[PDB]
Design a protein around this nucleic acid. Structure first.
Lengths: 138, 109, 190, 251, 199, 176
RNA sequence: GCGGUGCGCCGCGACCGGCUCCGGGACGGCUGGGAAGGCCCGGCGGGGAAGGUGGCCCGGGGGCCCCGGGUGUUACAGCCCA
RNA sequence: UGGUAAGCAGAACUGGCGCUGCGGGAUGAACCGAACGCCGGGUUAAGGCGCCCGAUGCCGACGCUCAUCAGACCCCAGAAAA
RNA sequence: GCGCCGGAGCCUCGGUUGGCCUCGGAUAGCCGGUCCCCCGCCGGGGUCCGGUGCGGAGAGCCCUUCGUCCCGGGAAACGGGGCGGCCGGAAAGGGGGCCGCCCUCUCGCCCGUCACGCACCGCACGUUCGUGGGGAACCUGGCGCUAAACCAUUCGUAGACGAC
């Protein structure tokens, strides 16, 4: 049933720590609970990093288990993980999560005025979809 | 209009175990649960609002029964967003687990 | 330590359709449907190949006492297929010295009378497990035949009618009387 | 140091609050558990200890030394005049216990059943169940009565029937009847409640509840003896006469 | 402002620790489905741990002795009680705020009940380690109304299913009132999405 | 020595000081794994006094410098020879580790000799740390990671950050 | 007006100084005059094995697509040295 | 040193208790830290930081261990051979 | 002289400062849609299709409130507002959702017009839940209720005395 596997050259999303919110590639498995991880196009240095901080994504790209930072950089831009990330719903709702937490008090007003009206239009329409059910069985 | 203060709880005094110092309060501000988020509230004014039997004057108002002991959020307490406050009169232990109002208006933003 | 991976494939034949909702398996074939729930075991039951011609049970990062839980699911499901194709038949012969252990089945197999065990005027009425039915078969004077799909129930209900006829407050080495599981086989022969 | 010679313990502690029974009429703590395949029946009755006499019967037990031989057995005659069902009370099944859902009394409650609702019957204006009576003889009242039997066949699981003793038919001094919830243990809760409403304001003789040669359970309060010493109450060993401060006590 | 916590699948002390702390901070907590609480360690250990509790009774008058409460609501209430200064007034004013129930009664059956993930068996026990249901524990050591609670708990699950099915029905309508009505909510929607509420 | 934090490898060279009998005695180099240079210069004498007629008073430390990693990115296999005190007798042990860094694979030995054997750092004497090519590794806990196409999932992802809401309204997902 | 002196009570602010606890910036020294790494192209040449890439074989999974053995040193991946 | 040993009896050296509060060891004359005018702020010791109870509500690190009698912090308050 | 429904004010106890109206549950797995098919009175079962670091997200949702005019544009007309039917609810029964009028406006909600309301002159307990709980009596209108308990007396199934 497991879909994502700690595989040699899996793109993994770092959740917390120094390099939080960055895609690192699993270069080699060091230990039972740590891996050598590099992200040259995402500005993560070739370094050891535990599996507890990284949420491993659904991208695997072919380089050998000992390949130096240049041969990771080739496979990162050959596949083009920077653009293929930001079109994933997960990536789109990290940067949507960023936006709501960066919302100004003036921006918070303009959204409240939008949400109020945007809800009033649907609440009128669902109530009309509600009468469209009651009207069939009579 | 609307609310101009944040919900804090008088969660006891600054105390070891077998000694309490009643001069400093320990405030639990709702929402902040780390030392990273308690930095906004340092220097802010904190009010313990209660009311008694007798009427007392109200500044810019007619005499209510409502009273205050005004204070000040002096510094952060512990590792989990608890904060130290120091009131002009030492808060009564009646107030333990009751609402005090950490204000906004020693504002730095 | 933690072994990175331990797996063991069950070569399930053409005759059997095994399918699995979660780590619960359902196994059906020529003679009925067997369902066992392996919620207690904490493994990955994969079912791979076209026609699903084998089961694959993975255990990732397992200590010594968790790699023991791979071959148990293998053997349990293998006996969940033998019961589904060939069934299970535990022929058990009634040993006595003097008194004939007089066995006849009420409730068309689901209850076993045991009369005249060591001249006991008490009569023992052993209710069989749901699915299994005993039968005093022919061509052997003292002979009980249980038949059923579940290896568990045919064997459990055999050990009910074995532990029913125990010799109390005597030397059990001299008094070898009772009904004992003489042959573990299958209902129909491969 | 130990009990030199071992002896069993004087009395049981399985009743040990040895106090005046706060009820004079004995409560049925536990009625029998029902199976809804039985016919509908009252599970209990309420009598009066009349007296005591001999009996002679030819004992029909094989094996005994008194097989087909006549014995003298002591018997208690309990005068059990037929009881009047005057109400039904439904019990809903709750996780905190077994809550009384709703009581429904009858229209005509007997004048002796009224006396139980009074400490002083002489002084009272006797207005008990005079407003509840009017629920039956108004068109809007029968409805909310019928919405209870609708509710109490639905929500309730334990249906008990209020059946008082008819005190007029006894040589006793008292006129104040004894109310008692008797659990109707029978079929479904619907059938159980249709049956008790049929028995409402009606006689129930003992033949309806009990039959001949039946093993039953007699519940009641003991013959009161007042303040009794430990030699009388607990039946302990008396002390050997030379004792200074009393011989009729626990040493 | 009432924490209606779910008791199902939570650990007995882990939840009691967090309940006892909130309640001292002037919070009114309701812990519900207390039979659903389970204690770490296999069943026979935890039963023996509670059987030993039954034996600790006052020799000269057990009526004075430790009141061994059997119901899972009052086994959970007791373990919270031990984590409070219940001899003082603020620890007695504490227990007045806490309100503990078996199954889920009427006020709370039609209320979204919270979960403490820090006090949760799936989170806090290794899945290989055995645990003991407080529902089974209470029953076998003198609690009477397991089967009575279980049916009323089942009579609301089938009742609360009909709510959820009728909520999925409104939520199908709501999304189908967005495919239909997208042309005239767009200028309103496309400022929600610039502030990251919908993407 | 308290085996505190991550250990650093030190090249501590020291000579028995000039005499009339021996003006220029032979220099003695050692691989000392220490939290800092002060206790590297302490543990230098501990091992040198055990081997040579040389206390700190009748000697000097000529160069106590930290030796860094010559391949801190290459994941390597380290064979450490131990000499630890049990509660009864002392034991020679060959133990394998798998770290980027020599000095952290030695740290990973100090946490493990504590974990398994309750051996506090003063009991332990690291005598030899050798990088081993992946055939010369007998202990199978390291040999399971000698795999070109190594592939394991992260099976039961127990969540931390259990207190950030503390009162969520959903049972936490653990399959990822 | 200035200077002294205070407020009936409740308060607020300002800057200066003392002592404090943290945050942000920026500069420099040293080492094996850091170790590794990035970037030019694994520059030209030679070598070695492996947790063995392609090649080929083996065994079988798919409508030609891919996994699991073997062979052996760069090919349609890389890795450590001279 | 005597004694099987003793919260036993008898010495040497230093420090305690007595005469002495305080923080910690839940609680203890002596243990550990530190000795005391009355106070405000700061910071520590020895101990701690699920809750009682101030403080881990660190996305702490790597292991060990399942007990039908778990284990859990100097003095110290229950164990051995096997 | 008390129970139901229908202003003016004095005491007293103080805590609060918007709501969440609900699947069951899994965890080595989930959530949400569909008919060629199937047993069930429109429920379950799949099959397929999407989602899954939960976005049909509690990291969420709902309500968001200086007041009003004048005049516009989208938006609503299946709307808002309150008087008599129908239409819900036991584990500790609740304030709902609807189909019908007698009905009052085309106002409420989102952008822009046009001016205005102690603009109380930098300042604190403001803003709420709240006609909150409790305690007395006062003006009062309909609609309504006319009891017991204890002593005493008596009994003796009871009893030191109370109690029963």
């Amino acid at each position: 049933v497991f879909r994502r596997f700690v595989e040699v050259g899996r793109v993994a999303y770092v959740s917390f720590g120094p390099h939080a919110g960055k895609l690192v590639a699993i270069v080699d498995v060091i230990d039972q609970n740590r891996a050598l991880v590099d992200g040259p196009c995402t500005r993560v240095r070739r370094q050891a990093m535990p599996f507890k901080c990284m949420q491993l994504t659904d991208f695997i790209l072919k380089f050998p288990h000992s390949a130096r930072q240049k041969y990771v950089r080739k496979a990162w831009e050959k596949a083009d993980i920077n653009t293929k990330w930001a079109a994933t719903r997960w990536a789109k709702k990290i940067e949507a999560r960023e936006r709501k937490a960066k919302m100004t008090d003036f921006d918070r007003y303009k959204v409240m005025k939008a949400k109020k009206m945007r809800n009033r239009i649907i609440k009128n329409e669902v109530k009309k979809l509600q009468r469209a059910a009651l009207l069939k069985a009579s | 209009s609307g609310r101009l203060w944040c919900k804090a709880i008088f969660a006891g005094y600054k105390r070891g175990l077998r000694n309490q110092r009643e001069h400093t309060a320990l405030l639990k501000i709702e929402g902040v649960y780390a030392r990273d988020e308690t930095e906004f509230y340092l220097g802010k004014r904190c009010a313990y609002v209660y009311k008694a039997k007798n009427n007392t004057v109200t500044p810019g108002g007619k005499p209510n029964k409502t009273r205050v002991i005004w204070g000040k959020v002096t510094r952060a307490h512990g590792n989990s967003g608890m904060v130290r406050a120091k009131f002009r009169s030492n808060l009564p232990a009646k107030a333990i687990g009751h609402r005090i109002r950490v204000m906004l208006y020693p504002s730095r933003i | 330590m933690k072994t990175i991976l331990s797996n063991q494939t069950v070569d399930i034949p053409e005759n059997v359709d095994i399918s699995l909702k979660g780590r619960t398996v359902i196994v059906k074939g020529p003679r009925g449907t067997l369902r066992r729930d392996f919620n207690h075991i904490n493994v990955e039951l994969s079912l791979l190949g076209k026609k699903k011609k084998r089961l694959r049970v993975d255990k990732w990062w397992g200590n010594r006492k968790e790699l023991a839980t791979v071959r148990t699911i293998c053997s349990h499901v293998q006996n969940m297929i033998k019961g589904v194709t060939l069934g299970f038949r535990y022929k058990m012969r009634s040993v006595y010295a003097h008194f004939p252990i007089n066995v006849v089945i009420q409730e068309n197999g689901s209850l076993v009378e045991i009369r005249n065990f060591l001249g006991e005027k008490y009569i023992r009425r052993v209710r069989m497990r749901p699915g299994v039915a005993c039968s005093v078969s022919q061509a052997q004077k003292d002979e009980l035949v249980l038949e059923g799909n579940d290896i568990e129930l045919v064997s459990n209900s055999a050990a009910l009618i074995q532990q029913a006829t125990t010799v109390k407050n005597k030397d059990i080495r001299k008094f070898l009387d009772g009904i004992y599981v003489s042959e573990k086989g299958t209902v129909q022969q491969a | 140091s130990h009990r030199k010679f071992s002896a069993p313990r004087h009395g049981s502690l399985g009743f040990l609050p040895r106090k005046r029974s706060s009820r004079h009429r004995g409560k049925v703590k536990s009625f029998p558990k029902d199976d809804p395949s039985k016919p509908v029946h009252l599970t209990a009755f309420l009598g009066y200890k009349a007296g005591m006499t001999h009996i002679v019967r030819e004992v029909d037990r094989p094996g005994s030394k008194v097989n087909k031989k006549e014995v003298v057995e002591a018997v208690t005659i309990v005068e059990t005049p037929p009881m009047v069902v005057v109400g039904i009370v439904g019990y809903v099944e709750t996780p905190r216990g077994l809550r009384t859902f709703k009581t429904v009394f009858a229209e005509h409650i007997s004048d002796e059943c009224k006396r139980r609702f009074y400490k002083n019957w002489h002084k009272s204006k006797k207005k008990a169940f005079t407003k509840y009576c009017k629920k039956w003889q108004d068109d809007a009242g029968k409805r909310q009565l019928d919405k209870d039997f609708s509710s109490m066949k639905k929500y309730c699981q334990v249906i008990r029937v209020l059946a008082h003793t008819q005190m007029r038919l006894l040589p006793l001094r008292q006129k104040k009847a004894h109310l008692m919830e008797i659990q109707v243990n029978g079929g479904t809760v619907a059938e159980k409640l249709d049956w008790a409403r049929e028995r409402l304001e009606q006689q129930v003789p003992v033949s309806q509840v009990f039959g001949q040669d039946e093993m039953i359970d007699v519940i009641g309060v003991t013959k009161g003896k007042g303040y009794k010493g430990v030699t009388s109450r607990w039946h302990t060993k008396k002390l050997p006469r030379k004792t200074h401060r009393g011989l009729r006590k626990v040493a | 402002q009432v924490l209606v916590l779910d008791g199902r699948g939570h650990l007995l002390g882990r939840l009691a620790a967090i309940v006892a702390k909130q309640v001292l901070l002037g919070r009114k907590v309701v812990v519900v489905r207390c039979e659903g609480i389970n204690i770490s360690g296999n069943f026979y250990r935890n039963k023996l741990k509670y059987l030993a509790f039954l034996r600790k009774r006052m020799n000269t008058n057990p009526s004075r002795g430790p009141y061994h409460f059997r119901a899972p609501s009052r086994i959970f209430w007791r373990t919270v009680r031990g984590m409070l200064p219940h001899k003082t007034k603020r620890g007695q004013a504490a227990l007045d705020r806490l309100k503990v129930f078996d199954g889920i009664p009427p006020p709370y059956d039609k209320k979204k009940r919270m979960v403490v993930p820090a006090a949760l068996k799936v989170v806090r026990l290794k899945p290989t380690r055995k645990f003991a249901y407080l529902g089974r524990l209470a029953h076998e050591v003198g609690w009477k109304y397991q089967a009575v609670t279980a049916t009323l708990e089942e009579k609301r699950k089938e009742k609360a299913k009909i709510h959820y099915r009728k909520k999925k029905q409104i939520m199908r309508l709501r999304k189908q009132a967005e495919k239909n009505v997208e042309k005239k909510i767009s200028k309103f929607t496309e400022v929600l999405k610039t502030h990251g509420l919908l993407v | 020595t308290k085996a505190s934090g991550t250990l650093r490898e030190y090249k501590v060279v020291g000579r028995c000081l000039p005499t009339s009998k021996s003006p220029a005695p032979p220099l003695y180099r050692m691989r000392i794994f220490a939290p800092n240079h002060v206790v590297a210069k302490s543990r230098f004498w501990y091992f040198v006094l055990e081997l040579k007629k040389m206390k700190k008073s009748s000697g000097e430390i000529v160069y106590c410098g930290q030796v860094f990693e010559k391949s801190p990115l290459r994941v390597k296999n380290f064979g450490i020879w131990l000499r630890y005190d049990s509660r009864s007798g002392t034991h020679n042990m060959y133990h394998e580790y798998r770290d980027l860094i020599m000095a952290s694979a030695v740290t990973q030995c100090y946490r493990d000799m504590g974990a398994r054997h309750r051996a506090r750092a003063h009991s332990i004497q690291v005598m030899k740390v050798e990088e081993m090519a992946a055939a010369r590794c007998p202990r199978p806990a390291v040999k399971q990671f000698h795999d070109s196409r190594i592939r394991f999932p992260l099976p039961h992802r127990v969540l931390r950050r259990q207190h950030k809401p503390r009162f969520t309204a959903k049972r936490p997902n653990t399959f990822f």
